[PDB]
Amino acid sequence: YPYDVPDYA
């Protein structure tokens, strides 16, 4: 993936 995904909380 080009970006990491932050936690939603």
């Epitope: 990491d4 995904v5 932050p6 936690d7 939603y8 909380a9």
Partner: antibody, heavy 120, light 114 residues
Amino acid sequence: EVKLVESGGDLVKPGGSLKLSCAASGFTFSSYGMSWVRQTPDKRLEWVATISRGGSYTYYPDSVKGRFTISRDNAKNTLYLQMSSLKSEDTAMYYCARRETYDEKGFAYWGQGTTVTVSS
Amino acid sequence: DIELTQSPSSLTVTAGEKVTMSCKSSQSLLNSGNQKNYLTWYQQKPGQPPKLLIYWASTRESGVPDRFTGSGSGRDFTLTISSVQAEDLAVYYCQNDNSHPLTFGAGTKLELKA
């Protein structure tokens, strides 16, 4: 089928160190965040750490911040929790759990857990 | 930190009876992005991890009997069992899953009346 297996649980000396690991299977590891959550002898549940899917964001509550490091190895499908400066109150069953990166519904998938006992 | 108060702490029941559990939170659990209350309810039985029962406050997980209903909004949340079964004897935990730090209630334990 989604499966999480924790290991590393042991008796720790006062102020000692310990590293837990959790082997993931039955899903694409690299596409989901992961967490550690612990349950103390009094049965209270406490969130310990969360990691992003790529490993670049980590989160901790104040109770373990500076002492606990959550990491992952996406090639080996393994989640890690390195603990430092452990105290008796860190005694708990430690569970790894998947973070529902798509649905955002809480912890649907938990391992069976590993016991950590810390001397006072 | 968000604090979750579960009452009562334990509750003695008779099979068939309606039960009502309460989770009150110190702050709102509204995910502003999508207007859902990110409160999750879990069920724990001896020798096993907590089991997700209800999410987004009111959506039943797959395979959970429809005698379990989650409800409420803002700060006041309830878990109802329309007709309690001996297989539902367990500790019930609510969880703030909306904002760090993630926090759990202390649990409501269901026990059978002697």
